[PDB]
Design a binder for this molecule. Structure first.
Ligand SMILES: Nc1ncnc2c1ncn2[C@@H]1O[C@H](COP(=O)(O)OP(=O)(O)O)[C@@H](O)[C@H]1O
Ligand SMILES: Nc1ncnc2c1ncn2[C@@H]1O[C@H](COP(=O)(O)OP(=O)(O)O)[C@@H](O)[C@H]1O
Ligand SMILES: Nc1ncnc2c1ncn2[C@@H]1O[C@H](COP(=O)(O)OP(=O)(O)O)[C@@H](O)[C@H]1O
Ligand SMILES: Nc1ncnc2c1ncn2[C@@H]1O[C@H](COP(=O)(O)OP(=O)(O)O)[C@@H](O)[C@H]1O
Lengths: 483, 500, 494, 384
């Protein structure tokens, strides 16, 4: 069993450092030989060729946590790693695995009811852009750098507060579009799906339009052949331009003859269609892909509202806004020096918007920065003495497992871990729950988060603790398999 | 590998890789640095002096090397002046901070110290930069050319350099529309002298066997426009093919007057053996033309493009001012000057000695780059590793004030800033340490604008030596170098995913 | 494999330093020193380590020889001089790796030392005047700190500073030379240590010498003997004749060290003598030299005016006994300190603290020129020499700069051995001394030492950690000489 | 190396502690000794285990030496000392790998030691002194589980009488005790019940021909290291001895019959071929003095000792009885039996109980054994 615990320890260690706002970003090369630099732990786990079946269980637990809450994945990883370390030392003491399992389950049950007793909930509602953005600050603060958080929070919140209707939100509604070039400050909030285009024969004031989707991207005898090709192409463009079609998209490049025939129908020619854009268009307007030119029909055709060229961002873009709901889709324009940092910002925006979605169904906020972890550790380790028997060891180890989060959050910030843990635990008796770990000072000092506004969601913490405990338990109940 | 694991060992490996990549461009710093030979496989050895060219053609495979090369290339693309400086400075940062890494200095502390030091340096530069733009540079340009000939001072071209400087800046002033290096191109011609080198506001291309067919063209023609043809020009069914060939040959002459083009261009070979056949056509032709000439003609004169055999258009003979074809060094050269958008200036590299192409392309190109960069910006600082010394002194003085980890790191940053003048005086070939010591002394006590002199190998006041560099470009270079160093420092793992 | 015998020498010196590096400071870790016979030795001070370390390299031989001769010169500083020399050698090797000839480095080092001694001589401290007592008492308290007697340490410091300064024994050529053995311990049973009071004279806790001894004596003569006055079968029976003969010469208070006499009660009243057995040899020798007397075994024949004088002998209830208070002697040597409590067994740590406080106070009073400890001098010298090297302008800039940087190894090792973040402590010390130069009004911010207790920068002249100027100056001289000598021995190939 | 040497030292400590970790308690397991000849030894005592085994690490040698020095100072507990030292040095591994200095660990250990001392002195149950009841209770507690269970009825009262024979009244109330000054008389033969006690020094050496006034009603012993010769032509030393008029003068050289007559002329009894471990206890029990320098010779050269001398040849061997000594600090204890294989162990455990008694004079306290005290102090620290 120690082999499984060792494998899980290694996999937790490889992503332990990326935890917290000062996470050390790693270099990532995938099988098609790119070169990323990313601090997002879920991204690291994606490109890790994890083969050990024991660590696969923790990876699946992390995926479930992300699939349901969208944040705290690395918390699940590090918590499971600490739990397995302490379970391993308990086993080395001589305790049976069953007793450790029972103690862990009892401790998790205790923590789940202790947790809702230390909540300082949301202020009034998802509205009041400034306040709610202040709530959404910590996630983006941690996931990407701590500098441009003040602007990224406003950018990511102004877009999501657009449609707080009936208390229902969807992550896919808030889309992100890439526009390279200027710095991040030039980014803003826009409405409706956006990408590039080529031609300029576009009409701005458009009623419910008609989208054509192209799934497949584009001496007398020579003259007669040229005439035949020209007439066939003209027949095809007439056949695709029938039924009052107004906009056409294709995944290929432009042709002078093709754009000329499109413009002679007063139709713009849109090109540069990405491998991912067609499905998004089909789901957003209820359209379909047409393989060849010869089968166009009115029924197999989706509907947009407005199409025009926007010069925002020092470049020409197309807009497909005001869908059936007329406000459902809400994009975010991003500006950056290259595309490598574009992905980091989009992951930060996603890790903010999903926290907002979680907050929609739960207004409870919990003091982050290690405050809740140390509080839970103190509560559980105090409860441990009240429970005699063989489960006290496992309960105490569960408390020490909660102790690991501020430890990592400090040691990956250039601060002595033991010193800050001791100071935090000592202060936490009198300087109660709302105190946590300060990042700014190089000296191991502590700072209150209720004043500093460093908070994280209750539901995320609850689900992460539950899933991490379940993963540790289900990986402790395995004997071996031939490998 | 060798200890590519969590934390310290991988940072050490990355620092070593950055040192290796900087060593490949270490000695090319300075206007008269060393030179490198690179063979491109099949056997076309490449010889070049500029660092950015060397970096662009390297074979970097290491991730740290790649993530330094991309920063260097981005710096070059954003501003063309100063690429080997940022890589060298960043590698010096990494090498100076390396002996502090294995002692447990957490790399986040190094990142914070580097960022605050860079902010301090950028702030300090603004209090030293001096505006000189208005001081007789556009009108009464004597100061401009006085800064200009510095690229050719104390050389064999010392007597004649004033002529070239004044004349190229005359060309620059009348073409002040954000000039580019590609669209201001020079051409070399065999024979002649250096004093009589001249600049035609256009192109200068020699006519070869496959370049131009007909000679003695109507030079004094005031509407010559290029016609881009894309078909050949030169010359059971065993007789059908003969008939078809004769018909094609007869049809090739349908563009003589029906199309009405004085100059015709083609990408297919042209035969000068049939010059008299082309003499019947009695018009100029172009073939096997380079892409530079094509683009200069398009954005200068605006020649038409033809695809069909009888492609007729109204742009075949549009409005272009003058046509020029004058023999240069006993050989006729084609000059497509006189254009409505003639933002072109091709320089005749006249000279008997043929091996001077490297000399002229290293001298005049740098001179015009300095002129353009001085014109664009307003405020400059003393160069030759002078501003680096001032920044190092200021940072060293400020570091002693702050208590804590950042003190040693800012001191190491200031020490690392000294490598630019050291490398300059090393490439110049003189004893670096003596120059550095004299510079540090006289620069901490005496003045703030002393650098290295490449001629006499002694300290000098580069301010009155008219060695100007814009404050903005130096600030950007320093920021880019510091950010590249920080990006390297912040990385501690690589993930491979080799096959499956 | 190696490439330069210079490198081999510098690595040998570095290894020798690293052997003794961790023991620098009062909280240095111990070292085990085992020989071939299997015997073991425990040690803390670097002098003992180097005096018996089994070295093997000629460069190490030279370095240890210089350390030993420095020890024979002044004493403390062997570990510091070795560490500094090793740091200079490492930095000079790094310099010569950059194509700087070692002769320029040597000249730069010599200039740096010559300037450093001048800087020290202009920024030392001579506060050990007759008006400087707060510094001395604070030094005594700090040396008496980190103990359960710290609360009582204030009274002990007050009682010891005046005790040592009042007993200052002048010398032949006119310098204050306090003898450490003049101060004597005196155990006491009963009341705890929180009621101790200074006694200006020695009083052995023993049998009562006599009962007729007056409280104050106008004229007394110490007639010290060793034999016991007893009857047997200048006098064959040593009870009367020689006693009266010495009394005729002027002997008032006969210091009978031997056994008691059976008819000396009358002599103790008519003459006023005393009889105390098993007197400590050091105590009796000091009480004789406190009055200019010498020990006399017999009285066969010096007796006229050579015997010492006693001015007052208090006979009352002291220490729950009838003590003999032989005080107010001729020379400034007679004193004794009460050691309250129950015995000398449970007060061993506090009496050892008393001895070490006495040692530090006598070190401070001697060599009136003193400098702060805790690495303040090293940081101040580094700050000075960084400016000096730039002001030089020759080719010795780098040599002097590396000499300045190398001096910071002393506070660095002090901070490491104190279990603190060494870089932060040295940086804080360096920053405090920066303001001593840039700011012309913060002149009295120069002796910021290293407080090893809390591991934070601390004003040290107020604290009281002190070092003789001669020790630092001469240790710097020897470190420079050793570095130069090793750095010269380079042009070899092997 | 740095902390590598610390880890090596404590690893040697651990690997030497668990060697004897199993051989304590009333159910100690046996150990195997395999000398490089083929012999095999049964052993329960960890002290002999460490003594016979050979080690190469200086740390292990130092710990073995400290275990020994504890053995001959206080008696038992060597296995417990080794086990405890190994355990603390093993649990220091976790902190020494925290990159945290040994000095703070040392300070924490010292604080823990002080608190453990306090909580032991708090939890200790009192016992009475000079009372046979709980003295025999302690005999049942600790003096048992040894080879004495068959002979406890005699060991108990032997120790209980022996408690008042080695007292020094120097600085307080009978707080000083010395260990070798008890006159041990181990002789096989006869029944074990013949073992008894006597107040005085018991000397196994005697004069060859006791045809002289050996016993006097007030022995004033004088010690001398000089050798007695025929005469001056040394009777001069005897003549000088006559000056103070003693009755017994102890030497360390042989005496002849004519020398015997020359001595009895001065009426002084000398002894020969005696041991220093006998001469020192004779002087201690008699308060005599040794001096031969004529200048120092005074009335102090004679110190009165015993008050009754007797010689008995029990089983045709020359005993010497010196009873009613001036100082009852070196007095006779008698041992009888057949073989010295167990009586030595019973003796040593009895003086262990003697040390128990003297500490009871200092602190009449007992700590609950069987791990009770250990867990009590562990709880005290953990709650503290
Ligand atoms: N400014 C801050 N100071 C201290 N702790 C912070 C700060 N910002 C975020 N944190 C903590 O760092 C953690 C980051 O979680 P994160 O690594 O983003 O999880 P995931 O990557 O799975 O979304 C949060 O739980 C939060 O408590
Ligand atoms: N005449 C000169 N005198 C002193 N320094 C010079 C001179 N010309 C150029 N330099 C130095 O060369 C440096 C730039 O050279 P280099 O980096 O090789 O070219 P580039 O900047 O185009 O990459 C500048 O820092 C400048 O100080
Ligand atoms: N109270 C104190 N606080 C800080 N440092 C001290 C103190 N006492 C002594 N030191 C340090 O001890 C060092 C000298 O002792 P050391 O040279 O180790 O003695 P030795 O030469 O006998 O080995 C000095 O550098 C001084 O800084
Ligand atoms: N009958 C008993 N029941 C439980 N524990 C006992 C008993 N007898 C002795 N012990 C334990 O044995 C320990 C001491 O034995 P040990 O140290 O091996 O003997 P020694 O001190 O001679 O080496 C004590 O801690 C005591 O608690």
């Amino acid at each position: 069993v120690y082999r499984n615990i060792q494998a899980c320890k290694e996999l937790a260690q490889t992503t332990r450092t990326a935890y917290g706002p000062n996470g050390m970003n790693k270099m990532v090369i995938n099988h098609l030989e790119k070169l990323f630099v990313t601090n997002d732990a879920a991204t690291i786990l994606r490109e890790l060729e994890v083969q050990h079946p024991a660590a696969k269980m923790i990876v699946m637990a992390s995926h479930m946590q992300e699939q349901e809450v969208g944040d705290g994945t690395n918390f699940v990883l590090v918590f499971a790693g600490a739990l397995l370390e302490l379970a391993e030392e308990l086993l080395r003491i001589g305790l049976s695995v069953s007793e450790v399992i029972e103690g862990y389950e009892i401790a998790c049950r205790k923590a789940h009811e202790i947790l809702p007793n230390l909540v300082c909930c949301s202020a009034k509602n998802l509205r009041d852009i400034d306040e709610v953005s202040s709530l959404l600050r910590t996630s983006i603060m941690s996931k990407q750098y701590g500098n441009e958080v003040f602007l990224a929070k406003l950018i990511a919140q102004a877009c999501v507060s657009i449609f707080p209707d009936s208390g229902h939100f969807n992550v896919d509604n808030i889309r992100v579009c890439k526009i390279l070039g200027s710095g991040i400050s030039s980014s803003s909030v826009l409405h409706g799906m956006v990408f590039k285009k080529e031609t300029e024969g576009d009409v701005t004031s458009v009623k419910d339009a008609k989208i054509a989707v192209y799934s497949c991207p584009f001496a007398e005898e020579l003259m007669n052949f040229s005439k035949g090709e020209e007439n066939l192409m003209d027949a095809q463009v007439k056949a695709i331009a029938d039924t009052g079609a107004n906009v056409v998209v294709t995944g290929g490049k432009v042709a002078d003859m093709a754009l000329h025939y499109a413009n002679k129908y007063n139709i713009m020619l849109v090109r540069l269609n990405s491998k991912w854009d067609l499905r998004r268009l089909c789901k957003t307007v209820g359209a379909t892909a047409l393989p060849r030119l010869t089968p166009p029909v009115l029924e197999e055709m989706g509907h947009c509202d407005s199409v025009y060229l926007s010069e925002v961002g020092d470049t020409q873009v197309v807009v497909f806004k005001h869908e059936k709901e007329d406000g459902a889709i809400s994009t975010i324009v991003l500006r950056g020096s290259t595309d490598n940092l574009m992905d980091d910002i989009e992951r930060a925006v996603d890790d903010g918007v999903n926290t907002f979605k979680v907050l929609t169904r739960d207004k409870r906020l919990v003091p982050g920065g290690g405050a809740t972890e140390i509080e839970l550790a103190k509560q559980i380790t105090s409860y441990g003495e009240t429970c005699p028997g063989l489960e006290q060891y496992a309960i105490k180890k569960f408390a020490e497992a909660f102790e690991a989060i501020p430890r990592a959050l400090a040691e990956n910030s250039g601060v002595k871990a033991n010193e800050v843990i001791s100071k935090l635990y000592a202060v936490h008796q009198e300087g109660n729950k709302n105190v946590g770990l300060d990042i700014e000072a190089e000296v191991p000092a502590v700072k209150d988060m209720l004043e500093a506004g460093i908070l994280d969601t209750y539901l995320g913490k609850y689900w992460a603790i539950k899933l991490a405990t379940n993963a540790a338990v289900t990986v402790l109940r395995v004997d071996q398999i031939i490998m | 590998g060798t200890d590519s694991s969590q934390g310290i060992p991988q940072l050490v490996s990355n620092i070593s890789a950055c040192q290796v990549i900087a060593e490949a461009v270490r000695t090319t710093l300075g206007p008269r640095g060393m030179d490198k030979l690179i063979v491109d496989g099949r056997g076309k050895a490449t010889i070049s002096n500029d660092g950015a060219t060397i970096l662009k053609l390297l074979d970097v495979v290491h991730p740290a090397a790649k993530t330094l090369v991309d920063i260097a290339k981005s710096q070059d693309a954003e501003v063309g002046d100063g690429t080997t400086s940022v890589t060298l400075l960043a590698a010096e940062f990494l090498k100076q901070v390396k002996p502090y890494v294995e002692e447990g200095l957490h790399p986040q502390i190094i990142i914070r110290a580097f960022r605050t030091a860079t902010q301090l340096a950028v702030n300090k530069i603004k209090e030293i930069a001096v505006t000189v733009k208005k001081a007789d540079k556009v009108e009464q340009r004597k100061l401009l050319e006085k800064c200009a000939m510095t690229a050719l001072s104390s050389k064999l071209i010392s007597q004649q350099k004033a002529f070239f400087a004044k004349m190229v800046v005359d060309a620059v002033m009348m073409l002040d529309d954000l000039l580019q290096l590609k669209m201001i191109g020079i051409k070399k011609v065999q024979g002649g002298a250096l004093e009589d080198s001249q600049l035609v506001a256009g192109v200068a291309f020699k006519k070869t066997f496959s370049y131009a067919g007909f000679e003695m063209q109507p030079k004094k023609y005031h509407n010559p426009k290029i016609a881009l043809l894309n078909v050949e020009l030169e010359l059971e069914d065993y007789q059908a093919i003969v008939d078809a060939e004769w018909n094609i040959l007869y049809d090739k002459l349908e563009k003589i007057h029906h199309s009405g083009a004085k100059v015709v261009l083609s990408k297919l070979p042209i035969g000068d053996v049939a010059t008299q056949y082309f003499a019947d056509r009695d018009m100029f032709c172009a073939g096997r033309v380079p892409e530079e000439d094509l683009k200069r003609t398009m954005m200068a004169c605006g020649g038409s493009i033809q695809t069909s055999v009888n492609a007729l258009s109204a742009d075949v003979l549009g409005r272009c001012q003058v046509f020029e074809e004058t023999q240069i060094g006993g050989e006729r050269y084609n000059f497509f000057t006189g254009c409505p958008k003639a933002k072109t200036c091709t320089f005749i590299l006249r000279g008997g000695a043929e091996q001077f192409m490297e000399e002229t392309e290293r001298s005049l190109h740098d001179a015009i780059m300095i002129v353009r960069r001085a014109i664009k910006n307003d405020s400059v600082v003393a160069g030759g590793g002078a501003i680096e010394m001032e920044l190092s002194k200021y940072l060293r003085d400020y570091s002693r004030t702050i208590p804590g980890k950042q003190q040693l790191l800012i001191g190491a940053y200031a020490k690392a800033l000294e490598i630019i003048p050291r490398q300059l005086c090393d490439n110049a070939g003189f004893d670096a340490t003596n120059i550095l010591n004299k510079l540090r002394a006289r620069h901490a006590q005496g003045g703030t604008w002393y650098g290295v002199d490449i001629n006499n190998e002694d300290i000098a006041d580069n301010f009155e030596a008219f060695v100007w560099e814009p404050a903005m470009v130096r600030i950007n270079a320093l920021t880019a170098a510091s950010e590249a160093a920080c990006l390297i420092v912040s990385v501690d793992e690589t993930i491979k995913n080799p096959r499956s | 494999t190696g490439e330069t015998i210079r490198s081999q020498n510098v690595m040998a010196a570095a290894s020798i330093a690293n052997i003794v590096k961790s023991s620098l400071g009062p909280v240095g870790l111990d070292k085990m020193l085992v020989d071939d016979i299997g015997d073991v030795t425990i040690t803390n001070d670097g002098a003992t380590i180097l005096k018996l370390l089994e070295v093997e390299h000629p460069a190490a031989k030279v370095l240890c020889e210089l350390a030993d001769l420095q020890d024979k010169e002044v004493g403390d500083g062997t570990t510091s001089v070795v560490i500094i020399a090793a740091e200079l050698l490492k930095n000079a090797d790094e310099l010569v790796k950059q194509k700087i000839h070692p002769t320029s480095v040597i000249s730069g080092y010599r200039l740096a030392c010559k300037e450093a001694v001048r800087y020290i001589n202009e920024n030392l401290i001579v506060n050990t005047d007759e008006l400087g007592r707060d510094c001395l008492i604070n030094a005594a308290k700090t040396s008496m700190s980190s103990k359960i007697i710290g609360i009582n340490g204030d009274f002990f410091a007050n009682m010891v500073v005046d005790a040592v300064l009042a007993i200052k024994y002048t010398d032949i050529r006119g310098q204050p030379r306090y003898p450490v053995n003049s101060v004597n311990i005196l155990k006491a049973h009963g009341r705890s240590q929180m009621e101790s009071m200074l006694i200006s004279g020695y009083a052995l806790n023993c049998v009562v010498g006599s009962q007729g001894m007056p409280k104050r004596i106008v004229n007394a003569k110490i007639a010290c003997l060793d034999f016991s006055l007893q009857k047997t079968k200048r006098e064959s029976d040593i009870t009367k004749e020689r006693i009266q003969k010495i009394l005729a010469t002027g002997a008032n208070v006969i210091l009978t060290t031997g056994g008691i006499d059976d008819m000396c009660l009358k002599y103790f009243v008519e003459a006023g003598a005393m009889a105390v057995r098993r007197v400590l040899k050091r105590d009796l020798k000091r009480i004789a030299k406190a009055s200019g007397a010498t020990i006399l075994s017999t009285l066969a024949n010096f007796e006229a005016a050579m015997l010492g004088q006693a001015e007052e002998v208090v006979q009352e209830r002291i220490c729950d006994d009838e003590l003999i208070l032989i005080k107010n002697t001729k020379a400034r040597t007679s004193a004794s300190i009460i050691l309250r409590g129950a015995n000398d067994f449970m007060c061993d740590e506090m009496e050892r603290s008393l001895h070490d406080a006495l040692c530090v106070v006598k070190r401070v009073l001697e060599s009136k020129s003193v400098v702060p400890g805790g690495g303040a001098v090293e940081a101040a010298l580094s700050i000075y020499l960084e400016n000096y090297a730039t002001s030089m302008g020759s080719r010795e800039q780098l040599a002097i700069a590396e000499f300045a940087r190398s001096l910071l190894v002393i506070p660095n090792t002090l901070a490491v051995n104190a279990a603190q973040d060494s870089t932060d402590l040295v940086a804080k010390l360096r920053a405090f001394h920066n303001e001593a130069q840039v700011n012309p009004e913060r002149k009295n911010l120069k002796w910021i030492g290293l407080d090893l207790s809390n591991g934070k920068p601390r004003d040290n002249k107020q604290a009281g950690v002190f070092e003789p100027t001669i020790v630092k100056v001469k240790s710097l001289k020897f470190a420079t000489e050793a570095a130069i000598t090793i750095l010269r021995i380079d042009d070899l190939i092997k | 190396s740095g902390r590598k040497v610390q880890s090596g030292n404590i690893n040697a400590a651990k690997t030497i502690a668990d060697i004897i970790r199993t051989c304590l308690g009333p159910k100690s397991m046996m150990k195997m000794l395999l000398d490089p000849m083929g012999g095999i030894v049964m052993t329960n005592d960890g002290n002999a285990i460490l003594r016979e085994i050979q080690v190469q690490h200086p740390a292990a040698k130092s710990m073995i030496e400290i275990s020994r020095t504890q053995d001959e100072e206080v008696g038992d507990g060597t296995t417990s000392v080794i086990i405890l030292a190994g355990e603390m040095l093993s649990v220091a591994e976790h902190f020494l790998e925290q990159q945290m200095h040994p000095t703070v660990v040392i300070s924490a250990y010292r604080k823990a030691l002080d608190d453990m001392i306090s909580t032991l002195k708090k939890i200790s149950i009192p016992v009475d002194i000079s009372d046979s009841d709980m003295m025999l209770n302690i005999i049942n507690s600790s003096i048992t589980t040894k080879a004495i269970s068959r002979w406890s009825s005699l060991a108990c009262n032997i120790a209980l009488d022996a408690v008042k024979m080695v007292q020094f009244e120097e600085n307080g109330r009978k707080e000083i005790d010395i260990k070798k000054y008890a006159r041990v008389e181990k002789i096989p033969g006869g029944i074990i019940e013949d073992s008894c006690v006597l107040r005085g020094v018991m000397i196994n050496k005697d004069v060859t021909h006791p045809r002289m006034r050996r016993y006097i009603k007030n022995p004033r012993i004088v010690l001398l290291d000089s050798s007695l010769e025929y005469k001056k032509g040394i009777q001069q030393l005897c003549e000088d001895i006559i000056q103070l008029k003693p009755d017994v003068v102890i030497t360390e050289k042989g005496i002849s019959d004519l020398a015997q007559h020359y001595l009895m002329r001065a009426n002084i009894t000398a002894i020969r071929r005696v041991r220093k471990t006998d001469n020192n206890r004779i002087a201690r029990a008699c308060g005599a003095r040794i001096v031969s320098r004529p200048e120092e010779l005074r009335e102090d050269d004679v110190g009165t000792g015993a008050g009754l001398l007797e010689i008995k040849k029990i089983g045709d061997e020359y005993f010497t009885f010196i009873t009613d000594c001036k100082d009852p600090k070196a007095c006779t204890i008698l041992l009888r039996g057949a073989s010295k294989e167990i009586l030595s162990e019973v003796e040593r455990n009895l003086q262990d109980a003697m040390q128990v008694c003297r500490n009871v004079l200092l602190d009449p306290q007992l700590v609950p054994g069987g791990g009770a005290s250990e867990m009590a102090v562990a709880h005290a620290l953990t709650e503290k």
